[PDB]
Amino acid sequence: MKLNISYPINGTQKCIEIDDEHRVRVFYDKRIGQEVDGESVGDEFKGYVFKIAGGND
Amino acid sequence: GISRDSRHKRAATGAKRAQFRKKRKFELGRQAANTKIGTKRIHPVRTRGGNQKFRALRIETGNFSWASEGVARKTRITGVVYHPSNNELVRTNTLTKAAIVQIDATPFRQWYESHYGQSLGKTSKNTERKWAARAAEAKIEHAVDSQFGAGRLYAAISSRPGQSGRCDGYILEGEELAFYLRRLTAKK
Amino acid sequence: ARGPKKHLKRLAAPHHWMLDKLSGCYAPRPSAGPHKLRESLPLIVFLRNRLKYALNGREVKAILMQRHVKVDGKVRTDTTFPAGFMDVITLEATNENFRLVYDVKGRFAVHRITDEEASYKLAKVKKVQLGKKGIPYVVTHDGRTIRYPDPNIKVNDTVKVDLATGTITDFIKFDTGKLVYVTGGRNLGRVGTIVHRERHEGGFDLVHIKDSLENTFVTRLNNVFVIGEPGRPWISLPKGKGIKLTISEERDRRRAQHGL
RNA sequence: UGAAACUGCGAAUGGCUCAUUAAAUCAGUUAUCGUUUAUUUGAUAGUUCCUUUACUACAUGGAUAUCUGUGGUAAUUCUAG
RNA sequence: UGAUUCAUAAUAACUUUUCGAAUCGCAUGGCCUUGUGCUGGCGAUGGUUCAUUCAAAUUUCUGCCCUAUCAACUUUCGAUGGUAGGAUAGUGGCCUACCAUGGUUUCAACGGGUAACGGGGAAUAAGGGUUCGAUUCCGGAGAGGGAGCCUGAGAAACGGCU
RNA sequence: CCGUCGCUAGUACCGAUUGAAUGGCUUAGUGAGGCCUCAGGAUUUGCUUAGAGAAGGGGGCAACUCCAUCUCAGAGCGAAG
Numbered sequence: 057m058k059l060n061i062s063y064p065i066n067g068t069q070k071c072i073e074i075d076d077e078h079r080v081r082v083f084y085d086k087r088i089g090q091e092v093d094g095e096s097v098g099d100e101f102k103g104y105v106f107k108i109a110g111g112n113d
Numbered sequence: 114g115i116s117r118d119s120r121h122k123r124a125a126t127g128a129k130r131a132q133f134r135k136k137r138k139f140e141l142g143r144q145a146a147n148t149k150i151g152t153k154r155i156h157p158v159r160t161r162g163g164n165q166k167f168r169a170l171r172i173e174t175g176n177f178s179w180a181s182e183g184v185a186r187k188t189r190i191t192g193v194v195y196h197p198s199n200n201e202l203v204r205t206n207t208l209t210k211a212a213i214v215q216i217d218a219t220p221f222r223q224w225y226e227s228h229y230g231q232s233l234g235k236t237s238k239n240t241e242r243k244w245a246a247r248a249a250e251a252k253i254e255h256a257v258d259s260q261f262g263a264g265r266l267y268a269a270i271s272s273r274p275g276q277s278g279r280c281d282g283y284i285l286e287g288e289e290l291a292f293y294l295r296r297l298t299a300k301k
Numbered sequence: 302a303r304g305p306k307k308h309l310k311r312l313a314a315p316h317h318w319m320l321d322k323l324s325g326c327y328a329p330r331p332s333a334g335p336h337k338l339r340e341s342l343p344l345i346v347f348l349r350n351r352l353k354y355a356l357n358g359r360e361v362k363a364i365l366m367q368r369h370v371k372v373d374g375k376v377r378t379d380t381t382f383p384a385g386f387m388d389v390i391t392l393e394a395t396n397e398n399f400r401l402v403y404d405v406k407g408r409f410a411v412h413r414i415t416d417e418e419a420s421y422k423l424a425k426v427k428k429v430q431l432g433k434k435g436i437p438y439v440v441t442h443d444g445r446t447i448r449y450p451d452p453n454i455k456v457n458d459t460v461k462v463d464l465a466t467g468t469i470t471d472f473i474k475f476d477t478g479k480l481v482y483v484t485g486g487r488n489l490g491r492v493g494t495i496v497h498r499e500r501h502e503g504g505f506d507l508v509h510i511k512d513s514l515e516n517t518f519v520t521r522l523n524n525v526f527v528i529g530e531p532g533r534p535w536i537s538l539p540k541g542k543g544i545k546l547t548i549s550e551e552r553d554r555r556r557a558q559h560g561l
Numbered sequence: 562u563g564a565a566a567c568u569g570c571g572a573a574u575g576g577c578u579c580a581u582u583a584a585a586u587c588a589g590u591u592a593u594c595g596u597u598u599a600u601u602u603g604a605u606a607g608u609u610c611c612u613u614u615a616c617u618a619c620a621u622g623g624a625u626a627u628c629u630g631u632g633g634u635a636a637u638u639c640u641a642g
Numbered sequence: 643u644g645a646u647u648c649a650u651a652a653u654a655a656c657u658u659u660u661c662g663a664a665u666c667g668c669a670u671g672g673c674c675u676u677g678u679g680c681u682g683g684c685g686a687u688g689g690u691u692c693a694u695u696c697a698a699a700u701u702u703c704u705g706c707c708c709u710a711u712c713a714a715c716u717u718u719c720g721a722u723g724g725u726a727g728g729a730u731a732g733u734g735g736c737c738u739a740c741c742a743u744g745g746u747u748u749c750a751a752c753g754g755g756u757a758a759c760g761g762g763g764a765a766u767a768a769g770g771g772u773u774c775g776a777u778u779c780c781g782g783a784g785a786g787g788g789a790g791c792c793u794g795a796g797a798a799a800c801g802g803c804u
Numbered sequence: 805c806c807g808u809c810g811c812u813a814g815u816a817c818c819g820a821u822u823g824a825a826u827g828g829c830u831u832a833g834u835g836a837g838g839c840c841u842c843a844g845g846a847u848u849u850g851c852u853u854a855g856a857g858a859a860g861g862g863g864g865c866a867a868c869u870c871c872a873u874c875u876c877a878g879a880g881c882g883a884a885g
């Protein structure tokens with residue numbers, strides 16, 4: 057589904073709509089307040105590090 | 114919820130007073146504190162007119178006072194020795210007002226060693242004179258001495274720790290003390 | 302109900318306002334001040350119904366804002382500030398200095414007082430206690446608390462307060478044969494001498510008081526205020542001078558004095 | 562000058578209605594030496610130090626909202642980063 | 643003070659040491675040890691217990707409509723009192739423990755009914771009365787019912803919540 | 805003029821239905837929800853001198869003529885939660 061990605065220092069952030077389910081499947085059964093890698097999330101993100109905090113059902 | 118209404122309480126005669134109005138806040142009474150002795154804990158409660166009202170919880174320590182000497186100290190409590198309202202407060206060991214307790218006593222001893230300096234249980238030249246001037250004033254009523262020796266002074270706590278927060282009390286002397294001792298003996 | 306009441310309905314409004322039964326739902330609730338609700342007088346009632354310097358509430362408010370009004374030295378801006386018995390209202394434009402003093406009937410008379418007298422305030426003694434740091438202080442039934450009063454200033458005495466400074470000029474001891482002014486009920490507004498003091502343990506000290514006409518009356522002690530020594534009152538009292546005539550007498554006075 | 566928002570205070574007044582409620586409410590009458598009381602006007606705090614030969618003051622700290630941005634939801638005076 | 647263990651002031655300690663202006667608008671004075679030095683006005687708000695005022699809970703005394711086809715009731719499950727505690731802003735069986743057996747009643751207790759919220763008052767109107775009072779004022783209750791609580795000086799709030 | 809027995813209407817009375825309904829009390833069992841309470845510790849940080857890369861990281865090679873220094877592995881000690 058959608059993702060809600062934001063960079064701190066630059067102050068620049070974006071919509072990343074994800075219909076492909078495999079990509080989504082990285083975050084399943086994690087909890088708010090954890091770390092994530094870039095490469096498994098998608099092909100556009102590689103080398104990056106997400107920090108999982110916040111979401112919505 | 115827990116109220117202090119005379120609305121309920123049937124009547125002087127007996128007629129069942131019907132529930133006139135839903136009970137008010139100004140009529141309220143809070144849940145009991147029943148402070149034990151096991152780590153120092155306090156929670157305030159915002160009362161009527163604001164006004165915080167410290168509830169002792171598991172209170173250790175408190176300034177228990179002499180009468181004869183006219184003193185009190187940063188002194189620890191040991192246990193609830195005899196509470197004259199209810200003995201359930203001795204099993205559970207819930208410290209309260211006018212419950213008889215045993216006092217750490219070391220602090221008291223130390224103070225005495227400064228005050229008179231003759232020791233209970235069994236330097237410098239002008240201070241000697243002072244010492245001489247003092248002492249042989251209070252001989253102490255035997256039981257108290259024994260308690261001191263033990264490390265466990267018999268007091269009755271007289272601060273209400275559920276209201277005040279502090280657990281300050283009174284070293285027992287004379288007739289009342291004797292009575293308390295007797296009661297304790299009877300119990301045991 | 303549920304806390305402090307904030308309105309005053311116009312019928313429930315105290316009668317010595319002399320308000321209209323009609324002309325609005327409410328009356329001005331005199332706010333928290335130095336005088337008791339019913340024994341007070343708000344600055345609306347004074348500047349609208351009595352003086353008529355303001356045609357309405359808004360006008361009164363405006364006047365207050367302008368700050369020509371001064372009730373007892375200080376300025377005031379509150380429409381419903383309870384200016385009570387003995388309070389000195391000075392309007393600086395006009396120079397119409399007033400002291401709030403009662404009429405023989407009971408209602409507050411508009412006493413157009415001089416500038417030299419409107420300067421001090423005579424005030425009663427409610428208490429004599431000591432506060433913190435062992436300092437003796439007197440309290441007045443007319444608002445103030447004054448630290449350090451002459452040791453022989455006891456309860457129910459009267460005290461000339463300098464007002465500007467808020468100190469003590471002088472005092473009168475409450476006793477037999479000393480001019481007294483009445484502030485309670487059926488005798489409210491009269492003036493007399495003091496004859497007796499029925500002691501009574503707890504239940505209200507009475508005072509048998511005769512006026513200039515040798516007409517006796519009785520009041521409770523709390524309802525009496527010591528105004529001077531017989532002949533020399535410390536304040537200028539209004540026309541009538543606390544006599545309070547009989548009804549017939551009053552009628553006669555009215556219908557004798559026809560001067561067109 | 563000032564939207565917004567945090568702080569303040571207000572929302573316990575007023576208005577309505579008479580269901581309960583029969584020594585209860587209520588009326589006058591007392592008392593609080595039996596108490597709380599924002600507001601009110603009056604009052605008012607050299608002692609915070611902790612041995613006393615080199616120490617925070619002409620101004621101490623990091624947050625959070627507006628915003629701006631990344632959003633979810635079929636919806637709600639919804640609010641996550 | 644009618645009256646106190648009152649006001650209040652000392653001695654003794656404790657204290658998860660409250661408070662003790664790192665606050666905003668105008669105005670911009672006084673001495674030179676000539677530094678930008680030390681100093682000082684008109685106000686706002688806070689903040690301590692004591693006053694006061696607005697109030698607040700209780701509380702004294704006396705007073706309610708019909709009913710005996712309600713004569714006993716209260717007291718296991720607080721009734722009455724005591725002692726102690728707990729709680730409360732505080733008094734108090736308000737609650738707890740232990741003990742005593744009280745407490746009310748034909749001067750109608752208790753129960754039942756009210757098409758009863760109380761009073762000011764209203765109608766009638768010789769005197770005495772009789773009936774009515776939901777309703778402009780004062781009190782009291784309630785916010786569909788019953789419960790519980792947050793915030794707050796003040797609510798057991800319902801144009802607050804559970 | 806009084807009763808019984810007739811006819812036509814209506815009022816109440818008793819009355820099986822294991823009647824039905826509403827409310828008030830109420831046994832036993834359950835028991836929502838808050839308040840306190842025993843813990844519990846998502847998170848937020850201060851102070852520790854705890855080693856940096858820092859280009860005068862305190863007024864000129866140097867424990868910077870080392871600055872609330874560049875700032876995270878500290879970890880200890882808290883406070884709120």
Ligand SMILES: [Mg+2]
Nearest residue numbers: 162163164795
């Ligand atoms: Mg207060």
Ligand SMILES: [Mg+2]
Nearest residue numbers: 502503504505
């Ligand atoms: Mg009295």
Ligand SMILES: [Mg+2]
Nearest residue numbers: 302574575576
């Ligand atoms: Mg109302």
Ligand SMILES: [Mg+2]
Nearest residue numbers: 647648649650
């Ligand atoms: Mg005292």
Ligand SMILES: [Mg+2]
Nearest residue numbers: 726727733734
């Ligand atoms: Mg008691």
Ligand SMILES: [Mg+2]
Nearest residue numbers: 707758759775
């Ligand atoms: Mg009636």
Ligand SMILES: [Mg+2]
Nearest residue numbers: 580581758759
């Ligand atoms: Mg009714």
Ligand SMILES: [Mg+2]
Nearest residue numbers: 759760775776
């Ligand atoms: Mg009525």
Ligand SMILES: [Mg+2]
Nearest residue numbers: 579580757776
């Ligand atoms: Mg009705």
Ligand SMILES: [Mg+2]
Nearest residue numbers: 779780781782
């Ligand atoms: Mg009403």
Ligand SMILES: [Mg+2]
Nearest residue numbers: 578785786787
């Ligand atoms: Mg309805």
Ligand SMILES: [Mg+2]
Nearest residue numbers: 135785799800
């Ligand atoms: Mg409610």
Ligand SMILES: [Mg+2]
Nearest residue numbers: 577785800801
């Ligand atoms: Mg509504």
Ligand SMILES: [Mg+2]
Nearest residue numbers: 573799800801
């Ligand atoms: Mg309302």
